[PDB]
Design a binder for this molecule. Structure first.
Ligand code: EEJ
Length: 238
């Protein structure tokens, strides 16, 4: 996160840190708890991930230093990638992780609500991007979960900023015209959380951008409201 501040413990209980154990264990991506055995993340996170057996999901974490050999985690049973996913820049950058065990909800870990299909028209005024990512292009993973309030940007305005790309309605952009606050390397997969009528909604999944927090270069997120039925299809399967 560029131009963000340290989070307080329990501020974002749906945020998880997805680790890989191959070749050595490290933070790979962010993710959001959306159900008791479901993590919603970005499909691009699994480039060269051949098996869910090398994945570890840590919930209820503020600081990466809370994670040692003896810290409990959730194993991943299945990685579900959207069928139309090719690359982050083309959209469909969404995936579900089906956990091996059930998440017990509490003050440190609980699910975030998906946006309402009816709320496709509502304008979110209080949106925050979170993660343990870099605070500039050439940096390292941050120990403390960072947060940054960012304004949403219209599709038309985002399309102007990304000449050469096709900014679809399955993407949602966020950023300041002057830059300074954004997601960066290590934040992808994580949430773009918007508070509307005292309830937080998972409005976006951190996906891509040209550099980090550059002026007139909004961050590009998967527009979660457009995948609610896809999510239900995979999580409510008979
Ligand atoms: C000790 O542990 C560690 O150091 N762990 C560690 C783990 C992963 C990384 C990491 C992650 C990423 C991921 C994609 C990759 C995610 C993992 C899988 N993958 C590939 C290519 O293997 C894609 N992208 C973002 O996080 C956000 C993009 C982004 C998003 C927005 Cl909205 C705006 C601007 C953005 N950006 C523009 N330019 N930069 N950002 N990219 N590079 C690196 Cl090196 C670095 C360190």
């Amino acid at each position: 996160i560029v131009g963000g501040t340290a989070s307080v413990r329990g501020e974002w209980p749906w945020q998880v840190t997805l680790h890989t154990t191959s070749p050595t264990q490290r933070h790979l991506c962010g993710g959001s708890i959306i159900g008791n055995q479901w993590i919603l993340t970005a499909a691009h996170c699994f480039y060269g991930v051949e098996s869910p057996k090398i994945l570890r999901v840590y919930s209820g974490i503020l600081n990466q230093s809370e994670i040692k050999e003896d810290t409990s985690f959730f194993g991943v049973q299945e990685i579900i990638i959207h069928d139309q996913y090719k690359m982050a820049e083309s959209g469909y950058d969404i995936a579900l992780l089906k956990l091996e065990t059930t998440v017990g909800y509490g003050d440190s870990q609980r699910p975030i609500c998906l946006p309402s299909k009816g709320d496709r028209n509502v304008i979110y005024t209080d949106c925050w991007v979170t993660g343990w990512g870099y605070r500039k292009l050439r940096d390292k993973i941050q120990n403390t979960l960072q947060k940054a309030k960012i304004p949403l940007v219209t599709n038309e305005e985002c399309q102007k900023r990304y000449r050469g790309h096709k900014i679809t309605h399955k993407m949602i952009c966020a950023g300041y015209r002057e830059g300074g606050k954004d997601a960066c390397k290590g934040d992808s997969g994580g949430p773009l959380s918007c508070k509307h009528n005292e309830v937080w909604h998972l409005v976006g999944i951190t996906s891509w951008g040209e550099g980090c927090a550059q002026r007139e270069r909004p961050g590009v997120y998967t527009n979660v409201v457009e995948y609610v039925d896809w999510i239900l299809e995979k999580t409510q399967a008979v």
